[PDB]
PDB file of all heavy atoms in Angstrom:
ATOM      1  N   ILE C1340     -19.679  -4.202   9.754  1.00  5.87           N
ATOM      2  CA  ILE C1340     -20.855  -4.853   9.107  1.00  5.87           C
ATOM      3  C   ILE C1340     -22.035  -3.874   9.126  1.00  5.87           C
ATOM      4  O   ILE C1340     -22.793  -3.888   8.147  1.00  5.87           O
ATOM      5  CB  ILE C1340     -21.167  -6.253   9.659  1.00  5.87           C
ATOM      6  CG1 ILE C1340     -19.974  -6.895  10.364  1.00  5.87           C
ATOM      7  CG2 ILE C1340     -21.688  -7.146   8.547  1.00  5.87           C
ATOM      8  CD1 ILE C1340     -20.259  -8.301  10.826  1.00  5.87           C
ATOM      9  N   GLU C1341     -22.178  -3.024  10.153  1.00  2.02           N
ATOM     10  CA  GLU C1341     -23.263  -2.017  10.043  1.00  2.02           C
ATOM     11  C   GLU C1341     -23.073  -1.259   8.729  1.00  2.02           C
ATOM     12  O   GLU C1341     -24.044  -1.133   7.965  1.00  2.02           O
ATOM     13  CB  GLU C1341     -23.225  -1.070  11.240  1.00  2.02           C
ATOM     14  CG  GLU C1341     -24.577  -0.474  11.587  1.00  2.02           C
ATOM     15  CD  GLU C1341     -25.172   0.440  10.528  1.00  2.02           C
ATOM     16  OE1 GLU C1341     -24.517   1.439  10.178  1.00  2.02           O
ATOM     17  OE2 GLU C1341     -26.285   0.142  10.055  1.00  2.02           O
ATOM     18  N   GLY C1342     -21.847  -0.811   8.458  1.00  2.40           N
ATOM     19  CA  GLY C1342     -21.571  -0.069   7.216  1.00  2.40           C
ATOM     20  C   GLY C1342     -21.954  -0.886   5.997  1.00  2.40           C
ATOM     21  O   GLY C1342     -22.543  -0.305   5.075  1.00  2.40           O
ATOM     22  N   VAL C1343     -21.641  -2.184   5.993  1.00  2.51           N
ATOM     23  CA  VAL C1343     -21.919  -3.058   4.814  1.00  2.51           C
ATOM     24  C   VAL C1343     -23.430  -3.291   4.667  1.00  2.51           C
ATOM     25  O   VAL C1343     -23.897  -3.353   3.513  1.00  2.51           O
ATOM     26  CB  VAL C1343     -21.155  -4.392   4.908  1.00  2.51           C
ATOM     27  CG1 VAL C1343     -21.599  -5.371   3.833  1.00  2.51           C
ATOM     28  CG2 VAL C1343     -19.650  -4.184   4.858  1.00  2.51           C
ATOM     29  N   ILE C1344     -24.164  -3.442   5.774  1.00  2.00           N
ATOM     30  CA  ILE C1344     -25.640  -3.584   5.636  1.00  2.00           C
ATOM     31  C   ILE C1344     -26.167  -2.267   5.065  1.00  2.00           C
ATOM     32  O   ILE C1344     -27.067  -2.313   4.215  1.00  2.00           O
ATOM     33  CB  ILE C1344     -26.340  -3.972   6.956  1.00  2.00           C
ATOM     34  CG1 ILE C1344     -26.541  -2.772   7.883  1.00  2.00           C
ATOM     35  CG2 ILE C1344     -25.611  -5.116   7.646  1.00  2.00           C
ATOM     36  CD1 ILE C1344     -27.346  -1.654   7.265  1.00  2.00           C
ATOM     37  N   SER C1345     -25.587  -1.143   5.493  1.00  2.75           N
ATOM     38  CA  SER C1345     -26.010   0.176   4.961  1.00  2.75           C
ATOM     39  C   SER C1345     -25.764   0.201   3.451  1.00  2.75           C
ATOM     40  O   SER C1345     -26.661   0.661   2.704  1.00  2.75           O
ATOM     41  CB  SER C1345     -25.274   1.284   5.657  1.00  2.75           C
ATOM     42  OG  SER C1345     -25.697   2.550   5.174  1.00  2.75           O
ATOM     43  N   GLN C1346     -24.605  -0.297   3.024  1.00  3.61           N
ATOM     44  CA  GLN C1346     -24.261  -0.334   1.583  1.00  3.61           C
ATOM     45  C   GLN C1346     -25.304  -1.177   0.848  1.00  3.61           C
ATOM     46  O   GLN C1346     -25.793  -0.718  -0.188  1.00  3.61           O
ATOM     47  CB  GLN C1346     -22.872  -0.938   1.377  1.00  3.61           C
ATOM     48  CG  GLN C1346     -21.753  -0.148   2.038  1.00  3.61           C
ATOM     49  CD  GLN C1346     -20.398  -0.756   1.771  1.00  3.61           C
ATOM     50  OE1 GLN C1346     -19.686  -1.168   2.685  1.00  3.61           O
ATOM     51  NE2 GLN C1346     -20.030  -0.823   0.501  1.00  3.61           N
ATOM     52  N   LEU C1347     -25.616  -2.364   1.354  1.00  6.19           N
ATOM     53  CA  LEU C1347     -26.576  -3.212   0.612  1.00  6.19           C
ATOM     54  C   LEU C1347     -27.910  -2.461   0.537  1.00  6.19           C
ATOM     55  O   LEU C1347     -28.523  -2.460  -0.541  1.00  6.19           O
ATOM     56  CB  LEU C1347     -26.716  -4.562   1.319  1.00  6.19           C
ATOM     57  CG  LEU C1347     -26.336  -5.768   0.465  1.00  6.19           C
ATOM     58  CD1 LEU C1347     -24.973  -5.565  -0.180  1.00  6.19           C
ATOM     59  CD2 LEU C1347     -26.362  -7.050   1.284  1.00  6.19           C
ATOM     60  N   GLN C1348     -28.331  -1.866   1.653  1.00  9.10           N
ATOM     61  CA  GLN C1348     -29.675  -1.236   1.701  1.00  9.10           C
ATOM     62  C   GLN C1348     -29.702   0.019   0.828  1.00  9.10           C
ATOM     63  O   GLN C1348     -30.809   0.490   0.517  1.00  9.10           O
ATOM     64  CB  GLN C1348     -30.108  -0.992   3.150  1.00  9.10           C
ATOM     65  CG  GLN C1348     -29.387   0.150   3.848  1.00  9.10           C
ATOM     66  CD  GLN C1348     -29.987   1.500   3.537  1.00  9.10           C
ATOM     67  OE1 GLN C1348     -29.346   2.366   2.946  1.00  9.10           O
ATOM     68  NE2 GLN C1348     -31.238   1.681   3.924  1.00  9.10           N
ATOM     69  N   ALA C1349     -28.546   0.555   0.450  1.00 10.97           N
ATOM     70  CA  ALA C1349     -28.595   1.689  -0.501  1.00 10.97           C
ATOM     71  C   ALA C1349     -28.603   1.088  -1.909  1.00 10.97           C
ATOM     72  O   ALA C1349     -29.299   1.629  -2.786  1.00 10.97           O
ATOM     73  CB  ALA C1349     -27.433   2.624  -0.283  1.00 10.97           C
ATOM     74  N   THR C1350     -27.858   0.002  -2.109  1.00 12.46           N
ATOM     75  CA  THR C1350     -27.861  -0.714  -3.412  1.00 12.46           C
ATOM     76  C   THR C1350     -29.304  -1.082  -3.765  1.00 12.46           C
ATOM     77  O   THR C1350     -29.715  -0.820  -4.910  1.00 12.46           O
ATOM     78  CB  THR C1350     -26.981  -1.965  -3.352  1.00 12.46           C
ATOM     79  OG1 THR C1350     -25.681  -1.571  -2.909  1.00 12.46           O
ATOM     80  CG2 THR C1350     -26.877  -2.679  -4.681  1.00 12.46           C
ATOM     81  N   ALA C1351     -30.035  -1.652  -2.807  1.00 11.37           N
ATOM     82  CA  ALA C1351     -31.448  -2.012  -3.042  1.00 11.37           C
ATOM     83  C   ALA C1351     -32.204  -0.754  -3.472  1.00 11.37           C
ATOM     84  O   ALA C1351     -32.947  -0.827  -4.466  1.00 11.37           O
ATOM     85  CB  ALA C1351     -32.037  -2.606  -1.794  1.00 11.37           C
ATOM     86  N   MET C1352     -31.986   0.362  -2.767  1.00 10.01           N
ATOM     87  CA  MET C1352     -32.710   1.623  -3.087  1.00 10.01           C
ATOM     88  C   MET C1352     -32.418   2.029  -4.534  1.00 10.01           C
ATOM     89  O   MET C1352     -33.376   2.341  -5.260  1.00 10.01           O
ATOM     90  CB  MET C1352     -32.279   2.764  -2.164  1.00 10.01           C
ATOM     91  CG  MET C1352     -32.198   4.104  -2.877  1.00 10.01           C
ATOM     92  SD  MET C1352     -31.573   5.436  -1.825  1.00 10.01           S
ATOM     93  CE  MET C1352     -32.218   4.928  -0.230  1.00 10.01           C
TER      94      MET C1352
END
Side-chain angles (χ1 to χ4, degrees):
Chain C
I1340 339 184
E1341 208 295 302
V1343 171
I1344 80 58
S1345 181
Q1346 298 182 241
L1347 240 50
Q1348 73 83 243
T1350 306
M1352 142 184 327

